[PDB]
Amino acid sequence: MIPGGLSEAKPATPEIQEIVDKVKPQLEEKTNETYGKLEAVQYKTQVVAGTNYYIKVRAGDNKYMHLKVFKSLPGQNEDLVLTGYQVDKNKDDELTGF
Amino acid sequence: EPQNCSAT
């Protein structure tokens, strides 16, 4: 559990879920797709000048995606940002830095 | 001994 690394994997929470719902329009403004429901399945946190969520989202029968959102620091006025996303992920693929 | 904290 090094400094600046990623936390252990934790199950997703209602806040995480919310994050994925606030962020889902962004995944879409980029992939130009239209996903159905995206369900927060698991996640990891990383401490930067703010937080970097690494969300494992279940969206498609047994199709999983790995989104990466950066949450700003309470300070200035800024929302969640989709700073990355891996697609074609499995139910077990471990969440990781990227 | 090496600092165990930022290791594994």
């Binding site: 559990m1 400094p3 600046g4 930067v48 703010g50 970097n52 300070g75 | 930022s6």
Partner: protein, 220 residues
């Protein structure tokens, strides 16, 4: 040791506050912090060392660029690697790049590295008081994010080396009304907290201040 200590006050020994962004480079910011201070304390030259160097090359001393690392190990990198350049010659980018170290351009050196025993807070108190600002790690819970002023205490963190997650620079220590604290330099830009700074409660190994801390002896 004095009831208080503060390298900023003593002089041009502490660099400006740096911003590290969305990259897990906070460890590199402890390292560059300490060393800068050491050099200055020892010579009067205030230098701004490049963190990307550590982000791009420390790999061997068990670090992992933007996804983490520890300052002690960073110090070893600087030693064995034989130097570290500063910002103007190796700009900070926040992402994983491949090493661009250039030997004739390193501007700061590490001769040896002082490792403050595990959980030994007073040794930090000594070092910070008698020799240098100490680079350190601790568990950062959400509370911590809101931080604006005063002395940050926590009943949320647990002082174990199983979840410390943020390296910082102890630039002093002191006392407030009766509660003891640490004067700490952070790497989140001057806007956060007390102009980049925060004050954690001293004496309880709060969040693990004393878990894996160090300071470096500069080759000068």
């Amino acid at each position: 040791y004095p009831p208080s200590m503060d390298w900023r006050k003593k002089g041009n020994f502490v660099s400006p506050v740096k911003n590290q962004g969305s990259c897990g480079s906070c460890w590199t910011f402890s390292t560059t912090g300490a060393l800068e201070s050491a050099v200055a304390i020892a010579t009067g030259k205030m230098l701004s060392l490049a963190e990307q160097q550590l982000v791009d090359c420390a790999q061997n001393f068990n670090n992992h660029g933007c996804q983490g690392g520890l300052p002690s190990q960073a110090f070893e990198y600087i030693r064995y690697n034989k130097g570290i350049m500063g910002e103007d010659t190796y700009p900070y980018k926040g992402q994983d790049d491949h090493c661009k170290f250039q030997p004739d351009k390193a501007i700061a050196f590490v001769k040896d590295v002082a490792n403050i025993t595990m959980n030994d807070e007073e040794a930090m108190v000594e070092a910070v008081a008698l020799y240098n600002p100490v680079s350190f790690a601790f568990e950062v819970t959400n509370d911590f994010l809101m931080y604006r002023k005063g002395i940050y205490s926590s009943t949320s963190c647990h002082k174990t080396p199983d979840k410390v997650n943020h390296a910082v620079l102890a630039v002093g220590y002191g006392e407030e009304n009766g509660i003891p604290y640490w004067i700490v330099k952070n790497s989140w830009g001057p806007q956060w907290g007390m102009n980049g700074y925060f004050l954690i409660e001293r004496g309880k190994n709060m969040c693990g201040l004393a878990a894996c801390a160090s300071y470096p002896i500069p080759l000068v």
